[PDB]
C-alpha cells in the first residue's frame, strides 16, 4: 500500500488536516493506511475513517443519480437516438462507485469487525457494513440483488440486536443505526410500513430517556430525532 | 423528495 | 494517452454530461482527450475546455490556501511544534496544482496557440495562458518567481494588445481578461494603482458601447462590468 | 477578502 511507510499517528494527523480542506478522496485514502497498520481504532479514528467514506461516496451517488435520469428519458418514446455514450459513462461512475464499496467492506472484514468487542466499536461497524451494502444494492439490477440485499438486512439486524440489548435508547449511534434500517426498509426492501414503524418506535422510546442526559448529550440525541420526525412527515 | 440518512457527526 | 480510442465527438458528449453530474476530473480528462484530436476547437468547446480545468484548480487553490495558513500558524511564536506532517502535506497539494497548471500550458503550447488566428481564438487562448502562470505565481517561493510572473504579464499583454484593436469594449471576453489582469496587478504584481485604474477604464468603455447591443449581449457584458465595480468597491 | 476573477459562463 502506497501508506505503509508512513508513521500511524501522522496518517491520522493529515486525515484531519484533508478534512479541513475538503479533500475527502486524500482523507480515505490516509484512514484506509491507518486502518492497515492493523491496531484497533478508537472512537474519534473510527468516526474520522465513516466521515472520509461518506463524502467520497456520496459524490459518486450524486452523479449516478444525474447520469441515470438522462439515461432513462434517452430511453422514453419519442427520444433521438445519441448512441452509447450515456449509457458507457454511467457504467464508468457505476463501476467506480463499486470499487468504493467493496474497498471499504474489505477493511471492515479484514479485520475491524473480528477485533471488535465492545459494544460501541461492533455496532458502528456492522451499521457501516449495511451501509455500503445499501449503496451497492442502490445500482444493482443483475442476478446478485437479492444477496446484495439480504446482506445489507442481515448487518443491520446483527447491530439492532447488539444495540437494544446494550446501548440506551438514546445513543446517538442506536439511533442513527435505526434512522439508515428504517431508510432501508423504505427505500431498498420495498417496505414502507416497517420503516414507518421503526422510526416511530425509535423517537419515542428515545423521548421517554432525554430525562438522565446532559445539556450536551441532550443536544446530540435530539439532533438525530428531528431527522426521525422529518422522515415520517415525508412518508406519512 | 429523499430520506435522511445519518449526517456527519 | 487514455483517450486515444474514443472518439472526438463522443469526448465532447461526455464532457456535457460530467458537468451536468458535477463530475469535473473527468470533465477535463474527456477535454484533453478532445483538444489531443489535432483540430481546432469551436467557441463552445474552448468554453468547456476551460471551465473543467478552472473547477479543477479552484479546488486545488483552497485547499492549498487552508493548509498555507495552518502552516504559518505553527510558525508563530508560542505554537507547539508538530513535526513534517503539515509541510509534507501542503507540498502535497501545491505539487499536484503545479502538475495541472504544466498540463493546461502544454495543451496550449502543442498546438492550440500557434493555430489560432482568429481574435476570438487567440485572445481567449493568450488570456488562459495568463491565467495558468497567475496560479503558478500564487504558491511559487524560488529563483524562478520572477520569471513565472513575467510570463503570466507577457501573455496578458499580447491577448490586450489583440482585444483592442479587433474587439469591441463590451465583448465578454476582453471584459474577462481585464478583469484577471486587473487582479494580477493588485494580487501577484503589488501593483494596486495599476489595477484601479485598467478596471476603471474598461468599465468606463464598456459604458458607453453598451447603446450598440442587443438585450442578450447587454445582459452578458453588464455581468463582468459588475465584477469589475465589486473589485473597485473593494480596492477604494 | 479575496477580489473576482471571470467567472464560468
Ligand atoms: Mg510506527
Ligand atoms: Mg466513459
Ligand atoms: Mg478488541
Ligand atoms: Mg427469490
Ligand atoms: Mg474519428
Ligand atoms: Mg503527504
Ligand atoms: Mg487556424
Ligand atoms: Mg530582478
Redesign the interface.
Known amino acids: 500500500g502506497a501508506m505503509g511507510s508512513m508513521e500511524r499517528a501522522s496518517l491520522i494527523q493529515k486525515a484531519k488536516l484533508a478534512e479541513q480542506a475538503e479533500r475527502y478522496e486524500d482523507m480515505a485514502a490516509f484512514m484506509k493506511g491507518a486502518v492497515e497498520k492493523g491496531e484497533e481504532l478508537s472512537c474519534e479514528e473510527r468516526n474520522l475513517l465513516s466521515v472520509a467514506y461518506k463524502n467520497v461516496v456520496g459524490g459518486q451517488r450524486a452523479a449516478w443519480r444525474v447520469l441515470s435520469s438522462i439515461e432513462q428519458k434517452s430511453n422514453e418514446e419519442g427520444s433521438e437516438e445519441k448512441g452509447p455514450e450515456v449509457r458507457e459513462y454511467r457504467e464508468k461512475v457505476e463501476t467506480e462507485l463499486q470499487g468504493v464499496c467493496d474497498t471499504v467492506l474489505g477493511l471492515l472484514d479484514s479485520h475491524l469487525i473480528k477485533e471488535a468487542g465492545d459494544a460501541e466499536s461492533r455496532v458502528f461497524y456492522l451499521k457501516m457494513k449495511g451501509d455500503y451494502y445499501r449503496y451497492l444494492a442502490e445500482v444493482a439490477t443483475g442476478d446478485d440483488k437479492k444477496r446484495i440485499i439480504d446482506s445489507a438486512r442481515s448487518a443491520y439486524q446483527e447491530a439492532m440486536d447488539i444495540s437494544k440489548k446494550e446501548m440506551p435508547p438514546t445513543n446517538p449511534i442506536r439511533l442513527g443505526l435505526a434512522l439508515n434500517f428504517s431508510v432501508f426498509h423504505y427505500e431498498i426492501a420495498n417496505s414502507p410500513e416497517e420503516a414507518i414503524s421503526l422510526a416511530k418506535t425509535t423517537f419515542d422510546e428515545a423521548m421517554a430517556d432525554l430525562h438522565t442526559l446532559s445539556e450536551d448529550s441532550y443536544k446530540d440525541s435530539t439532533l438525530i430525532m428531528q431527522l426521525l420526525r422529518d422522515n415520517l412527515t415525508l412518508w406519512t | 423528495?429523499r430520506?435522511?440518512?445519518?449526517?456527519?457527526?
Chains 1, 3 share one sequence.
Not at chain 2, 430520506?3 to 457527526?9: G, L, R, Y
Open positions: 423528495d430520506p435522511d440518512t445519518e449526517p456527519e457527526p
